[PDB]
Design a protein around this ligand. Structure first.
Ligand SMILES: Cc1cn(C[C@H](N)C(=O)O)c(=O)n(Cc2ccsc2C(=O)O)c1=O
Ligand SMILES: [Cl-]
Length: 251
C-alpha cells in the first residue's frame, strides 16, 4: 500500500524545490514536513505519494458541518496521512485521529529588541504601543474567545482599534512591526522563523496558549500509534531538534 499523504504549501514545512532539474513525485518538494515524512517512512517502512490538498486549506467545518481542506481528504479516504503544520484540536478529533505532536507551540509576541517590554501584561496595560493579530486567524480567535482577564483586555483593545490593530496577514503584520511602534501576536513557531531572519526583531515573553501539530489519519487508522512511536523516537534521539534547526536557523 503506497500511502497518499495530503499536505499544504507553507514555508518552511513544505515548499517546491528551487530547481529545474528533472524531479518528479515527492522529489519536487522539500521542507521540514518532507524530512519528517522521510524519517517516518524509514522507521515504519511505508511507500508514499505526496499530494497537495486541492483546495489549499487546512481544514475547517461550515455551518452544515461539512469539512474542507486536509481534514476533508482524510474523512473521504482520499489521503492516508496529513503531514503538515496541522493543529491537534477537539473539533478535529471528532472526525479524524492524530499522532501525538511532533511540534508544540503557542501564541507569543513579535516586537523590536531593546525595549523594556517583557510580556503580554506589559502590552495590555498601555496604549502607546499598538498590538494586534492577523484578522480572523487562530490567534485572533484565541483572544476573542478567551475568559482570562488580561486577554479580554487585549481583545477589547484589538477589536475597538480594529481597523488598525488587526492586519491582513503575517507578512503585513511583520511589515507593521518593522516600520511602526507595533507588536504582533503570532504563533511561536512563526516568530522563531522570523526572528532568525531579522536581527531587529525578537520574541517577547513566553507562550500565551499551548497546542501541538500532529500527523492526521482517518479515524481508526492503524498508522496513528505507529507514527506516535516514531515521533517519540525522533524526539528522544534529537532528530526533531536537528530537523527544526535545519529549516529555522538563519544567517
Ligand atoms: C504554520 C501555520 C498554520 N496554521 C494553520 C493551523 N495550524 C491549522 O491547523 O489550522 C496557522 O493557523 N498558523 C498561524 C496563522 C496563520 C495565519 S494567521 C495565524 C495566527 O496565528 O493567527 C500558522 O502559522
Ligand atoms: Cl494518541
Amino acid at each position: 500500500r503506497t500511502l497518499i499523504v495530503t499536505t499544504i504549501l507553507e514555508e518552511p514545512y513544505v515548499m517546491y524545490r528551487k530547481s529545474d532539474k528533472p524531479l518528479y513525485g515527492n522529489d519536487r518538494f522539500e521542507g521540514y514536513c518532507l524530512d519528517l515524512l522521510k524519517e517516518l517512512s524509514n522507521i515504519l517502512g511505508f511507500l508514499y505519494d505526496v499530494k497537495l490538498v486541492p483546495d489549499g486549506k487546512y481544514g475547517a467545518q461550515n455551518d452544515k458541518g461539512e469539512w474542507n481542506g486536509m481534514v476533508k481528504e482524510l474523512i473521504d479516504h482520499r489521503a492516508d496521512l496529513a503531514v503538515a503544520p496541522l493543529t491537534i484540536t477537539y473539533v478535529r478529533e471528532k472526525v479524524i485521529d492524530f499522532s501525538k505532536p511532533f511540534m508544540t507551540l503557542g501564541i507569543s509576541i513579535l516586537y523590536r529588541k531593546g525595549t523594556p517590554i517583557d510580556s503580554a501584561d506589559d502590552l495590555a496595560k498601555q496604549t502607546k504601543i499598538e498590538y494586534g493579530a492577523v484578522r480572523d486567524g487562530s490567534t485572533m480567535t484565541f483572544f476573542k474567545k478567551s475568559k482570562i482577564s488580561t486577554y479580554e483586555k487585549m481583545w477589547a483593545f484589538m477589536s475597538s482599534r480594529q481597523q488598525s490593530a488587526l492586519v491582513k496577514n503575517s507578512d503585513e503584520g511583520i511589515q507593521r512591526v518593522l516600520t511602526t511602534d507595533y507588536a504582533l501576536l503570532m504563533e511561536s513557531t512563526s516568530i522563531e522563523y522570523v526572528t532568525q531572519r531579522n536581527c531587529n526583531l525578537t520574541q517577547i515573553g513566553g507562550l500565551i496558549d499551548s497546542k501541538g501539530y500532529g500527523v492526521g489519519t482517518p479515524i481508526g487508522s492503524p498508522y496513528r500509534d505507529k507514527i506516535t512511536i516514531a515521533i517519540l523516537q525522533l524526539q528522544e534521539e534529537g532528530k526533531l531538534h536537528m530537523m527544526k534547526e535545519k529549516w529555522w536557523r538563519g544567517n
